[PDB]
Symmetry: C7
Subunit: 242 residues, 7 copies
């Protein structure tokens, strides 16, 4: 690459935390700068690190299963500010040809909003098929959390244990994502603003029994703990503070 073009090669940090008692979501960001007299302007980098707990629990006594259909994070900003959005690693890499269980996407990013949906793709349950987020079957319906086939105890006790399911459903998925935003250097004004609509697109798995064979049902987006926590970026001070 860099050698392929035969080029010689040549082309301040902090942290944050906050938690929601009702929805239970941990949120963080990290930044870094250089004082490069050769580079054009300042660059700030947003890491989405945190913990969107799955709250994989039987809220309702089939069982209604509050599970994370797709944790989604979007770093959205008001229009009036002069900022602009540049890079969004990870990108949707060319689907090259493996079916990962959480296929992260970079939802179609306009110049102002860029947001991933780290969705729940296939999960193998008790040595069987894919079972993606909207996994939905004629008989067994969705198939995220079917503890077993031939259960005998109380249905409330018959729900797939968090341990055996995908380790993200039980205890959430920490977002490992990032992106950056840009603007000319010699502009008088500086201010910006963020949205950071952290999402936990909840979904239901109802295993209802026919008297011949178990079934399943899914109530997609039955809730969404989209605890929108708008952030504050302090650019000139070379700090990020909520």
């Amino acid at each position: 690459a860099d050698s392929d073009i035969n080029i010689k090669t040549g082309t301040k940090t902090g942290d944050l935390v906050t938690y929601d008692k009702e929805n239970g979501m941990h949120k963080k960001v990290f930044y870094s700068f250089i004082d490069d007299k050769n580079h054009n302007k300042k660059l700030l980098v947003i890491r989405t690190k945190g913990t969107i707990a799955g709250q994989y629990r039987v809220y309702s006594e089939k069982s209604g299963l509050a599970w994370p259909s797709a944790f989604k994070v979007q770093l959205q900003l008001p229009d009036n500010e002069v900022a602009q959005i540049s890079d969004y690693y990870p990108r949707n890499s060319i689907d090259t040809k493996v079916q990962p269980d959480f296929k992260t996407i970079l939802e179609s990013p306009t110049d102002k909003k860029v947001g991933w949906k780290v969705i729940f793709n296939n999960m193998v349950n008790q040595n069987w098929g894919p079972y993606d987020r909207d996994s939905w079957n004629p008989v067994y319906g969705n198939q995220l959390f079917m503890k077993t086939r031939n259960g005998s105890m109380k249905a409330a006790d018959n729900f797939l244990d968090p341990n055996k399911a995908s380790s993200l459903l039980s205890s959430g998925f920490s977002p490992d994502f990032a992106t950056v935003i840009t603007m000319d250097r010699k502009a008088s004004k500086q201010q910006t603003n963020i949205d950071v609509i952290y999402e936990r697109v909840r979904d239901d798995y109802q295993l209802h029994w026919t008297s011949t064979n178990w079934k399943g049902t899914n109530t997609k987006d039955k809730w969404t703990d989209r605890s929108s926590e708008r952030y504050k970026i302090d650019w000139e001070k070379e700090e990020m503070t909520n």
Copy 2:
């Protein structure tokens, strides 16, 4: 390589952004220089980074599907200027022998125009065959976005979800490409000019039902949001500015 020849080994940045409301395309470039008294002249490097959203949507109520057949980017220049084009990484690498879903090409580059067509090659749909860009089948026609085979709801609601399709069709494909252009050092004049005909070669997928089995149809190039955005390179100032 370098050791294979037994040689000892020895053989300023910025950013841009802009977006189109009608067509929805994000565009960027990045550059770099060295002050190498040993090297002959100046070198500028163009990164094509951006977001050509797929606009994978059912515009018309079969469904007409505005999907990106082949995002194409071409860095084309007027003849009169004294510049010349040198390197175009990625190149068409020797097809060595894997069928990637987007096989990037470097359309036959004359000395003045070099342009990739990052085309849509095979995509596996619901555990089946390749389905390239011009994928076209006797019965099912093109096969990009067939949600399922035995659907039962409204056809407008029966179109492959963006989530399950290739992550590029849903939310676009960020171009990861580059190239460079050259010219002698001791020339009095400097000026150049660019074209950057960003392309989103739209294409249609029509699933029309025969009453016995679904079909498909493709209206290739039914549109082309070839939002040609000519760029401006400011060479002497060691900056790139639109």
Copy 3:
């Protein structure tokens, strides 16, 4: 990644020990700092290193088998202190697609408690199936420690040898885990407090014979040598001391 964003690249230690004679658990931590005038605040890193012996022994004369169902470590803190918890490597990595024998989890970490359960997933016994922690079979019940099928000597002598079983059951599993906690720099007060509820979630394997074929039984959580050893962090002195 770092190159994918086209960035140039730019973004005091000690030890402890203690042992429990009744429960037999070795516990350790290690830390490190930098004096980075560019970084925002201080960072301390907790390594969980130690030895939670399995005590894989026949306590009761089927045999009752004190084995480690899931060593669990949780670095939990009181509410009143101003500290906050940031990073928890290892995280539950996206289940990407291998069935490891101990699938470490990061139990749903609230802002205050983060705790892994390094559980006992599949183990192959005498050239047979998975046998996870809650491995439980209609006939052979749990199947951790079945020395053989057709034994002939005293049952107390017929229990799977620690050597042949998973090397963690015999001699314990040293935790290789870590996490960190954060707080603003310019706060007047400093004090914190830890819990470190080291756990050895004991479990039983009872092989009871039917006179036709051996069986098994599991008494999950029949004990828990949850020898809760709360730790003391001395932050200002740049030392960790129990």
Copy 4:
């Protein structure tokens, strides 16, 4: 290797461009030096970078198909000059044991002429066999560009699309090759001379129909756009200039 001999380890750039309107070929070279008081003499390195477009087009209305049979580059020099040729990376590596589609060769290099033939070896067409450069079949003849088997439209429109064929046939193959030439240091005279017979060994693919099954034919070397562009090396000035 270097360690295998137990040795301690110890054992100015520019660019060019030019294009041909009639034949359509882009040509480039890059060089590098060191001022090594320990090394014996001066070394110059020739990179063959460029673009020999395939001109994969239906010139004649079977179709006559101007495709690149084997791009060939030869760095040949007059006899009278005192220079000598040393290294030719890539070499014909020991065929070690994969059938690449373009097997580059280093045609038998005399001391004066060294020239690769980056020939067209196997290419898979519509999920079938190898089809090398001189691919020639009893019935289907050569098999480079057979769009399909059971076509129905005008034959001029029935020729394999450049997109689906090997990406080198459509848009050419950029040569990634190099070599070097040598001479004693203390010689009074310096002058040299080059040939650089860039070649595009054109070849034809004629698909003629029998009324029972399509066929093919190949008219090897029906043309050769051997646009011989002799280069000029300016050795003493530590520059290469056409």
Copy 5:
């Protein structure tokens, strides 16, 4: 890992020898220090290097075969001294999922004793099954050293040649292991003491013939050349001396 936590990265030698003529065991250790004003205290590292010869010989005229069942090394210390034991690389790594022939274990290490049993797991003999340390078969008994099946010469001459057996049985297994021990820096007193119970847990392989088919027998722990060689550590002098 280190990058996964987004940290910047920042967190005197000798030798010994001795041999036993009766038991034939070579023993060694190596150490290293840093003068780190930032680190808390001193660290010493014990390498177990040596040669515990297998003495794979027919002592008794079936044959009684003095072979190393499990070389075991334990670095054990008296209670009264103020030292403590910290790290024991190699640890019992999570059995991740290969059946190695010597599966090293870290016997359940209390705070005072840590000892590996580098046991003899499966060995393929004449293109057949695993044959671990306690390998024991109904007919062929243990199966370490069965030269062949259909032998015809004197039984004393019919014992598996050391060359064909696992290279550890013939000529011993050099221990490649290590561990470390810790203590506060500001303690007035320093003295410690070691045990280093080098073990060669001898075992017998008796091939007794039934007149229909050979058999085998194993007399586990028939001897143990546990030549306990207690070592002396000279901590303050930054030397280790026996």
Copy 6:
């Protein structure tokens, strides 16, 4: 290795060319020194680089095929000089267990002569068997250059094309080999002498037709263009000159 012994780690160039018009062979060497006050003496390294063209041609009108059976290079020296030969990378590496087409050998090197025979091992011809250098078949005899099975044109035109054969037979094999020679430092005298018997062990492939099925024949060593070119090493001047 180096770490395996726990060691801390610590344990002038030129070029030549010449060509033979009758036999057509290119020959080169490269050297390197250090001024290591710690090392004992001087070391010179011989690289065998060059081009022994295969001259894969139909000299005689079956066809007699002048092909390179085994390029061989030997760096042989007179006895009287005080020099000695030390290292011969590449060595015959332990045949570890792949059947390469040219299995390089290091013919049994006495202290004075060391010479490789980079022989022609298996080559796959038209999707068939190995065909090593002395490849010789009852019916098809040697099988290096059988263009096809069912040819129909003139036999002189029916010989395997150089392109399809192993790329070494067509255009020769550049030797990538090396070795070194040694001598005490404090000896008054210095002079040495070389032989460098470059070899091209020619061999014939005669395809003679039986009227039922083609055959082959091989006249091994029918010639040997062993153009012995003795070299001259100028040791004291730290130069190698022919």
Copy 7:
């Protein structure tokens, strides 16, 4: 490993040659030192490099075949000297689970003698089985050098060509081995002594014909060109001289 223990990381050459005309064996050693004020004592490293030619020849007119059964090198020393032997890389690595053709062993090394037997393990002959050093078959006996099965010429001419056999049998195997020896620093006396019993454990392969099918025979150790060449180490002078 080093990171696994969480440590920061911190824990004069020459050459020789000699040859034997009767037995034909090349022998070499290389050394290295550091002036490490922190390390305890001096370390010397012995490389066994050389060439033990196989002398794979038909000495006797079945054929008696002088082939190298197991090159063996032993660095043995007199008892009276105060030296001691420490490290022997390569060691017998845990047989981890491939059947290499020469399985190097480290014969049971007492404190004074350490000697490898780089034995001849399996070799594939004409697309058939393993054939180790003591390879010995009921019918074909040993099977190192059976040119073919159905030969027709003179038996003296019917012996496997050195080219096709394992490249070590034809031209010998250069030993790539090493080891080191140790002693306290503050001892008044220094002198040592070596043995270096270079071995070429010759063995015979006799192919005797039954009139129905060829056979083989092996006369193991029929000779042993154990040309014992005792070496001289000059330790204080930091040189090794024979």
